[PDB]
A and B are shown apart, each in its own frame.
Chain A
Amino acid sequence: QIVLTQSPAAMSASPGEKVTMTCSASSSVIYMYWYQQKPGSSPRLLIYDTSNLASGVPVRFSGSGSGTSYSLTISRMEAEDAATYYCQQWSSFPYTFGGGTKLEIK
């Protein structure tokens, strides 16, 4: 059971600012996945294999990282983007998820 540490647990950002998150793993995984869950909606896949963007995902989203450290990058923040964020590992069973990241627009 690889424990994924999602840091920071919370952040605040203005529209247009760059936000950056870090998903730390208790071991070395291969690819990192990322999710968005709206306030009361179902999750959605955004970055898979730490490179590509899924459907309906703007180019503003990005991801990178290797080894045990993986990160998500959003170039320009928008007010509609406030939601929880998760990181998943495909490498070993069971599938483990990040702690979650909550953020609002000030």
Chain B
Amino acid sequence: QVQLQQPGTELVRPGASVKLSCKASGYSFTSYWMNWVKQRPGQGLEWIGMIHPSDSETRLNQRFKDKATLTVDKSSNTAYMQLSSPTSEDSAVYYCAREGYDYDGFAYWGQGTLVTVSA
């Protein structure tokens, strides 16, 4: 029933501002977290951080905390993801995922977006 709608490929620039959203449906947008994960080609997944839409409380990984900031919107039910200084390392596939209804560990995932950094 739940559907997380994520945009497609977005070309960026070396040091522009990346704007990435995530959509939510079929559940209360303020009742759970939103988790962002990156995928490099032929590489393992890494967890960027979370944000809680209720009070707009975020908790980020120690490494990506400085390179990323998160934003939520309760009205449009759309969570935002922003990155700073795109470089060759920032090219990856980003997923927005959330906890299971009683289960842990990201049972609901997103469709992913492919970030292409070019200069």
Contacts and interface: CB of A to CB of B under 8 A. Distances in A.
A80 B105 CA distance: 24
Interface stretch (B15-23, B69-77, B107-115): B107-115
Contacts of A97: 44-47
B29 interface: no
B100 A48 contact: yes
Interface residues of B, number: 21
B59 interface: yes
B61 interface: yes
Contact of B105 (A42, A88, A99): A88
Range, interface on chain A: 20 to 34
Contacts of A55: 107
A97 B43 CA distance: 11
Contact of A43 (B47, B59, B62, B109): B109
Contact of A48 (B35, B95, B104, B109): B104
Nearest to B110: A42
B80 interface: no
Nearest to A45: B107
B32 interface: no
A31 B61 contact: no
Contacts of A54: 100, 103, 107
Contacts of B110: 42
Nearest to B60: A94
A94 B61 contact: yes
